Amino acid sequence: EIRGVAFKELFRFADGLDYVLMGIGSVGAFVHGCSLPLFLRFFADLVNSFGSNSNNVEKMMEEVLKYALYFLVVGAAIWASSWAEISCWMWSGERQTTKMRIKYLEAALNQDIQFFDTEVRTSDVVFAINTDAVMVQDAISEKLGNFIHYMATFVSGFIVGFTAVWQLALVTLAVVPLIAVIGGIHTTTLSKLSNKSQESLSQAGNIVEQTVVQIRVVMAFVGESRASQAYSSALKIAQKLGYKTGLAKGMGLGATYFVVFCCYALLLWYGGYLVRHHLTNGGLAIATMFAVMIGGLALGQSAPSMAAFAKAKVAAAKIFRIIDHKPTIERNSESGVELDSVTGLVELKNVDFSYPSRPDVKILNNFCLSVPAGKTIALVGSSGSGKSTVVSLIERFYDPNSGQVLLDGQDLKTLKLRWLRQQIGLVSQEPALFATSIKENILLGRPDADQVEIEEAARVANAHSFIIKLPDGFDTQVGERGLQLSGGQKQRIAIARAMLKNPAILLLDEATSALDSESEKLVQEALDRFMIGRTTLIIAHRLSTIRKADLVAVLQQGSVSEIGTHDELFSKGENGKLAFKDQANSFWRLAKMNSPEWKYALLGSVGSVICGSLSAFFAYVLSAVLSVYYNPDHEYMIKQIDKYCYLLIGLSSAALVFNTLQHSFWDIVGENLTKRVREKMLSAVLKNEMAWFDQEENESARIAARLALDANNVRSAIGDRISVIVQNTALMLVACTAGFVLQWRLALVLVAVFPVVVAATVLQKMFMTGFSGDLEAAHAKGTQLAGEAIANVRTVAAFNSEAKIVRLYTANLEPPLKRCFWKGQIAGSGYGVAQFCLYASYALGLWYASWLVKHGISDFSKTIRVFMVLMVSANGAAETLTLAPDFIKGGQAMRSVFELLDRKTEIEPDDPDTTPVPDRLRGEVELKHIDFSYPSRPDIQIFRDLSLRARAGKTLALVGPSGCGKSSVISLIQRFYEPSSGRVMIDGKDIRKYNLKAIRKHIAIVPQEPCLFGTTIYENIAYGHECATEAEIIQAATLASAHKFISALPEGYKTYVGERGVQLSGGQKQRIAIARALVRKAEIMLLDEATSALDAESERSVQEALDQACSGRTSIVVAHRLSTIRNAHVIAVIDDGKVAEQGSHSHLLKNHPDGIYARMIQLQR
């Protein structure tokens, strides 16, 4: 484990402005922290004056006025301090982190390639840029300010409480730990249970992902229910964990309320005792209790900043480790001769390079390669030979071991590499394109070029292409949102960037196997014009360029064998605004969908209202006790205080019980709703046809992501919404009725500003969480550019364009900087305004209470009770709003799930219109005049009114060009896609009117790539038939010969096979797929060209298994390899969507000579 760097080093990249910002933010944070207990002290003074001066009205009025002015001053101070703190801390952190990001990327780019090979992985570098974008910035921007603020709040609260009433402060200090302890336990318990629920949800998502990637075989058979059952099990586990989560949350809230009620019972009694003995005032005691509570909670809230500091220390240690590293290979050297003879006569003698990470094995051991001066060389060394090692050595990526290696007669170390790499042009296996515009992606080959040179290079040496046939053209920033690039466009861009480096050698290598000939001919003309270009890593891919090269010296077993002529070369290298009515309707339909849980909801609802009442009740008690404090009759005050304390102790238990009840039952409602909706979504998805799966936004992990993300916000938007809207309604109703009954006038004035108080307290809690948004989302563009640069470090170094990448990174990072500055300003201003309005409302309400008392309208007791009850109830309501407010996201996901459910399938897997189905369908399939067009590409028509047919009980083999959709025929058979036109019949009955579900069990299919359903081979084989028992799969394995390795397998049938388990060989996987096909004992077998890339033993085994599989009943096979259709007695030709020759291969080979069969026979020779 790396040792975290000390805290001070985190501020390495701080300049003078950052120091000023940090100082101003620190002062603002200190003032913001201190001004809360100061407000409590001023409130105590105001209440004490307003209660003591009942007889002397004028003194009461003037003192209340001065303290209201103090409240306004404190509000203004809070406004200024919070604004300064938030803005300065956010912007300073962002600036420092951006500078450090830029320096990190700059240091990473100019590192040696061997650094990434051995020291730090590229994935580690990308993760490090994630960590520097998150943790270091978070610690030095928001966590530090919050730590200072909470230290200030803690110290100020303790000072205020002690200097007011040291006695009660000590008692309140002892009460603080209990509340803090319960809060910590509740938070930890929920986090642990949340982790359990999270992994359970991941399991459910994995099931959906697996089902979608295997949707073909799953739909081809009858696995739709099987998949739903597995999903049901995972959902059940998740809801059980959710039940625990909900019960734990309820218990935590109940426990903290119980402790709070009992502790304030004790504190209020002790405050009454102190008031009896003339040791304090009422307001002073109340403020002391509040201040000490605030200080303790502030320290508790400050601890997470320390946690963040530790994590960021570790992260910054890693980042500074990578930054401070110094490259070993010398760059910007002074030994460069800068020779103008760009032609490389001959070089690379006696190279003895050994791979840097592992010195045990060496490739370039003792041999020489040598080159001419202006003639290409083709290099073909086995398969895993060090063909790329020569390219790397030429580019000076590494260095040869102790020997004598030169270039052009002037060595490599004595020619620099800043301009040496300028002479050399490199084209990689896969072209490396960066997030900038394609125009700049042409520039970085030579920044000194102008527009005219770029366009002439792209035009005379490349054909007109998508760059000009484009809405944007030169300003076409690709990035992650790059347009459709099939490989040819980006490849041509890469060679163009290459030709901008006109002189000297140009290095080639193999491209993708499926590439158009235009790129190859452009490469050929590029190497012809730059005859200095040699060292093509063709690895036996273009015999024409091989004949072009004067020397085609090979690198067999990592060594040169023959150098010179290129004549025979045989037996070597044989490899080739949003609406609201719709939201209301969807809400109503989900509620109707949630009907079976109604009981729980009602009970939960009951608990909610009672919980709300308790909160209001608590507020009232405080008010009452305070109002009782300023009562001359001591015995009456004793009786009242005892009554209130006993009532509070009694109702603490009710608070606990009904908090647990409410949260448990609402969580049960929510979990049941999520499970039901998720199952319905999966069923609706599985009912859809394959054309729906082919469409975009509709495949693999992304559909699983939509399913996972559109259920939790649904549970929120139903359960949490109703729970809060009823509990806060009960709270507000009780508080408002108490306030009205006491003094309706002041109650009305206060409920005028009630939303302002609630909003301000909500913003206080949000400040507690933080106002910096998703830092990752802000720097997404820069992060992806940096990842592309680091992953493509070899290409960047080859084109010596590190500075260009750095400046592009800076230009991408500037808009996040500006956005962060403005966001900080807006957030600080808004928070300050809200707090100022809160304190202005407090001052106005309390002054109006004083004014009412002055004119004999009311009393001190009633007015103070109204004020305190309404304000504490506002705080409680805001604390209630802290529950997940994902309502808008909930509505959006509501619409998403509803449109997913209401989608209509064109092909219904079910058979509502039942048709007669024979028990043993013989299956005389006849695809007569079937006109089918590629679903993905309508223009492409694999079938053109082809009258294909196959007599039942007979084997038909489909042969023809790979381009024609011979496999697409089997898709039409399973009705995955419907032919653009034409009618297909299945044994005397058309399949359209026929029942698809009955057909599925009479059809067996083997995919070209076998797929792994689950853990055991047992279940994979049993998947073929609905009720496979045990003997049936035994015979399936024996006839399929799958048992041969199964007995050899340690666990046999029950071995864990798949991605994580024992990965069987391709032949074994295909053989078990064939076995599961035989399990279904279907009359019609649709054999696919699975035997594509296998070794000799696996080839023979899989063709044998195919021999037993196709034997018996009827089988439509598609094949392209000899000794496969020969066994079949009926062969068809798929030429251009039409049938050409029908009959046995031997029968049609004798007559009409030079036939299409003879064509592939001659080709296979």
Residues in contact with ligand BLD by the rule CB under 6 A: 43, 179, 260, 290, 293-294, 842, 868, 871-872, 875
886 is in an annotated binding site: no
Among all chains, which residue has been given the structure tokens 């007559």?
A: 1151
Rg of the chain over CA atoms, in angstroms? 39
Quote the least distance from Cβ 868 to ligand BLD, whole Å.
5
Quote the least distance from Cβ 285 to ligand BLD, whole Å.
12
H or E element at residue 899: helix 887-901
Quote the least distance from Cβ 36 to ligand BLD, whole Å.
8
Distance CA 295, CA 176 (A): 9
Nearer to ligand BLD, 43 or 150 (CB): 43
1053 is in an annotated binding site: no
Distance CA 365, CA 358 (A): 14
H or E element at residue 925: strand 925-930
944 is in an annotated binding site: no
Quote the least distance from Cβ 206 to ligand BLD, whole Å.
40
Nearer to ligand BLD, 370 or 653 (CB): 653
Quote the least distance from Cβ 851 to ligand BLD, whole Å.
19
Quote the least distance from Cβ 605 to ligand BLD, whole Å.
22
Identify whether the C-beta of residue 731 lies closer than 8 Å to the C-beta of residue 612: yes
Nearer to ligand BLD, 467 or 619 (CB): 619
Total count of residues recorded for the chain: 1165
Quote the least distance from Cβ 290 to ligand BLD, whole Å.
4
Alpha helix segments (H runs only) across 577-700: 581-593, 598-629, 634-687, 690-694
Identify whether the C-beta of residue 94 lies closer than 8 Å to the C-beta of residue 18: no
The CA angle 1071-1074-1078, to the nearest 5 degrees, is 135
Identify whether the C-beta of residue 924 lies closer than 8 Å to the C-beta of residue 948: no
965 is in an annotated binding site: yes
In this structure, are strands 925-930 and 946-949 parallel, antiparallel, or unpaired?
A: antiparallel
Nearer to ligand BLD, 87 or 153 (CB): 153
CA 630, distance to chain mean position in Å, is: 60
934 is in an annotated binding site: yes
Nearer to ligand BLD, 180 or 1148 (CB): 180
355 is in an annotated binding site: yes
Identify whether the C-beta of residue 805 lies closer than 8 Å to the C-beta of residue 796: yes
Nearer to ligand BLD, 134 or 871 (CB): 871
967 is in an annotated binding site: yes
Nearer to ligand BLD, 293 or 499 (CB): 293
Quote the least distance from Cβ 27 to ligand BLD, whole Å.
24
9 is in an annotated binding site: no
Phi-psi region of 745 (alpha: psi -120 to 50; beta: other; left: phi over 0): alpha
The two structure tokens encoding residue 133: 């974008």
Q: In 3D, which of 981, 973, 971, 970 has the Cα closest to residue 944?
A: 981
Nearer to ligand BLD, 67 or 530 (CB): 67
Distance CA 958, CA 979 (A): 18
Burial class from Cβ neighbours inside 10 Å (0-12, 13-18, 19+) for residue 704 reads: buried
509 is in an annotated binding site: no
Nearer to ligand BLD, 88 or 874 (CB): 874
Nearer to ligand BLD, 872 or 1003 (CB): 872
Nearer to ligand BLD, 852 or 872 (CB): 872
Report DSSP state, residue 1151.
S
Identify whether the C-beta of residue 465 lies closer than 8 Å to the C-beta of residue 489: yes
CA torsion sign for 255, 260, 265, 266 is: positive
Report DSSP state, residue 354.
B
Quote the least distance from Cβ 1011 to ligand BLD, whole Å.
54
Nearer to ligand BLD, 260 or 369 (CB): 260
Quote the least distance from Cβ 223 to ligand BLD, whole Å.
51
Q: In 3D, which of 279, 503, 572, 508 has the Cα closest to residue 378?
A: 508
Distance CA 751, CA 864 (A): 15
| Residue 1121 neighbours by CB under 8 Å, 6+ apart | 1089, 1091
Quote the least distance from Cβ 173 to ligand BLD, whole Å.
12
Quote the least distance from Cβ 676 to ligand BLD, whole Å.
34
Nearer to ligand BLD, 610 or 868 (CB): 868
Quote the least distance from Cβ 33 to ligand BLD, whole Å.
15
937 is in an annotated binding site: yes
The alpha carbon torsion through 479, 485, 487, 491 (nearest 10 deg) reads: -60
What angle do helix axes 802-854 and 754-769 make, rounded to 10 degrees? Answer: 150
| Residue 196 neighbours by CB under 8 Å, 6+ apart | 241, 244, 245
Distance CA 63, CA 850 (A): 10
Nearer to ligand BLD, 215 or 621 (CB): 621
Tell me the backbone φ, ψ of residue 1087, rounded to 5 degrees. -80, 130
Distance CA 136, CA 130 (A): 10
Nearer to ligand BLD, 731 or 871 (CB): 871
Beta bridge partners of 1085: 1004, 1115
The two structure tokens encoding residue 927: 């695809």
Quote the least distance from Cβ 883 to ligand BLD, whole Å.
13
966 is in an annotated binding site: yes
| Residue 1130 neighbours by CB under 8 Å, 6+ apart | 950, 951, 954, 955, 956, 957, 1142, 1143, 1144
Identify whether the C-beta of residue 949 lies closer than 8 Å to the C-beta of residue 1027: no
The alpha carbon torsion through 292, 293, 295, 297 (nearest 10 deg) reads: 160
Q: Which residue is nearest to ligand BLD (CB)?
A: 293
Quote the least distance from Cβ 628 to ligand BLD, whole Å.
16
Which residues in the chain are immediately followed by a break of C to N over 2.5 Å? 576
Q: Binding site residues, as ranges?
A: 117, 264, 355, 357-358, 386-389, 694, 842, 879, 934, 937, 965-967
Q: Binding site residues for brassinolide, as ranges?
A: 264, 842, 879
Q: Binding site residues for ATP, as ranges?
A: 117, 355, 357-358, 386-389, 694, 934, 937, 965-967
